[PDB]
């Protein structure tokens, strides 16, 4: 049942076995039931750790491929190993995106849930964009922006700049403009406005809100 | 080829994908050739991360069930989950122990090679002992330590890192498994004191690091 899979997923998180944690929360969503405020956090933390290992491995192997130019063997090995990580990375994102489109986004009856899943949809399309080679990158980048844009319009309309979902969405959206679209100016504009509007509204969950605001100012300092 | 498997193993270590790293070194061991000083380190680091991820997961799940005395439902799930990690942990060690007794320890040529694979045997039996067959695994673990301790004591210097590393893992075996916190402190202190009385540029780091861990084990045990 649901409570059995959720409790086992909480055990897999403590044991740091996120592949077991992901399969448990995937089954909870595949039952057609709208997730609670805790079940969607477990599903997110699960696949983010699963997808993060491939991303971290992809960056290292890709850096080696760029650095091993001149030695075709050391560079082709890195190329082929990277391509295998890419296939693992693509299957994970397609698993989450198909999970978001079939069960999560349609059943979302609250704007809080809808912005969360839409931001999550823009993220895993952005993770596919970091790896795309061509022909399909144009659409993947567009599909990532559309999910981000719809999430940004709902959040800015029905959430406050102190809400952690809106701040985190502005953080990931600005990263999308900077690293994917190569627009380092709208990235700073998105991050600075969301950071200043959060202070101006300031002018429980505030621990997450303060952390994201520090991440916004840090991205601004790095991009400058 | 041997070069491709090792090169990918070095590459899998950088990507932190030790399941692929262990599978490559297992294929190098399956080819029967005696592993070089670099290959035996890559094989060890590979399976140490693979077998250590299940050890860390096992310590967490069992510690959670100790506080679940009130609820019998959660106690079953934690018990069932712990047993699945135990089955994973058993299959990993038996995989290493099979390679040790079939390809590795048999073809052990030079002395330094014979001592390293002999230490690795007692370790993965010690990992099995951490989880009737108990005394059978514990004694099977002890003989590999003693056999390697005699060889390293007779033909190696107390400054060699393989001799110092074996003394460290042997001392841990007495404390955690045999519950002998005192017969091990002598072994750790003798191997430490026999080295301070006395080494190459390619060996100080591994040698001096183990001695630091030796005195750190002695301090921890003597609370």
């Amino acid at each position: 049942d649901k409570n059995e899979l959720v409790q086992k997923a909480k055990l897999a998180e403590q044991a740091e076995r996120y592949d077991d944690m992901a399969a448990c929360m995937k089954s909870v969503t595949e039952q057609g039931a709208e997730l609670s405020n805790e079940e969607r956090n477990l599903l997110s933390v699960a696949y983010k750790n699963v997808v993060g290992a491939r991303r971290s491995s992809w960056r290292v192997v890709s850096s080696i491929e760029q650095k091993t130019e001149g030695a075709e063997k050391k560079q082709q090995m890195a190329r082929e190993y990277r391509e295998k990580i890419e296939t693992e990375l693509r299957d994970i994102c397609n698993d989450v995106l198909s999970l978001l489109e079939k069960f999560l986004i349609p059943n979302a009856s609250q704007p809080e849930s809808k912005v969360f899943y839409l931001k999550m949809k823009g993220d895993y399309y952005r993770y596919l964009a970091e790896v795309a080679a061509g022909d399909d990158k144009k659409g993947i980048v567009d599909q990532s922006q559309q999910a981000y844009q719809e999430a940004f319009e709902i959040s800015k309309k029905e959430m406050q700049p102190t809400h952690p979902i809106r701040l985190g969405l502005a953080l990931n959206f600005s990263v999308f403009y900077y690293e994917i679209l190569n627009s380092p100016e709208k990235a700073c504009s998105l991050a600075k406005t969301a950071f200043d509007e959060a202070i101006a509204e300031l002018d429980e969950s505030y621990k997450d809100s303060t952390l994201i605001m520090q991440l916004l100012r840090d991205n601004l300092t790095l991009w400058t | 080829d041997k070069n491709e498997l090792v090169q990918k193993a070095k590459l899998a270590e950088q990507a932190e994908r030790y399941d692929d790293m262990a599978a490559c070194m297992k294929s190098v061991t399956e080819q029967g050739a005696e592993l070089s000083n670099e290959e035996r380190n890559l094989l060890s680091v590979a399976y140490k991360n693979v077998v250590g991820a299940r050890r860390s997961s096992w310590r967490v799940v069992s510690s959670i069930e100790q506080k679940t005395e009130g609820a019998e439902k959660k106690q079953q799930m934690a018990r069932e989950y712990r047993e699945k990690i135990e089955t994973e942990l058993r299959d990993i060690c038996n995989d290493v122990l099979s390679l040790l007794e079939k390809f590795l320890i048999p073809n052990a040529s030079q002395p330094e090679s014979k001592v390293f694979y002999l230490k690795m045997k007692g370790d993965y039996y010690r990992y099995l002992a951490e989880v009737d067959d108990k005394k059978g695994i514990v004694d099977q673990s002890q003989q590999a330590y003693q056999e390697a301790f005699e060889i390293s004591k007779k033909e190696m210097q107390p400054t060699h890192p393989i001799r110092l590393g074996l003394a460290l893992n042997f001392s841990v075996f007495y404390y955690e498994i045999l519950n002998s916190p005192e017969k091990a402190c002598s072994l750790a202190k003798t191997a430490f004191d026999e080295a301070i009385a006395e080494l190459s540029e390619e060996s100080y780091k591994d040698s001096t690091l183990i001695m630091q861990l030796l005195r750190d084990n002695l301090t921890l045990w003597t609370s």
């Binding site: 953080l171 | 955690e176 045990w221």
Partner: peptide, 12 residues
């Protein structure tokens, strides 16, 4: 640099 998004006995 990357952009930001949202006791025991020792052995050898």
């Amino acid at each position: 640099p990357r952009s930001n998004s949202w006791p025991r006995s020792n052995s050898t």
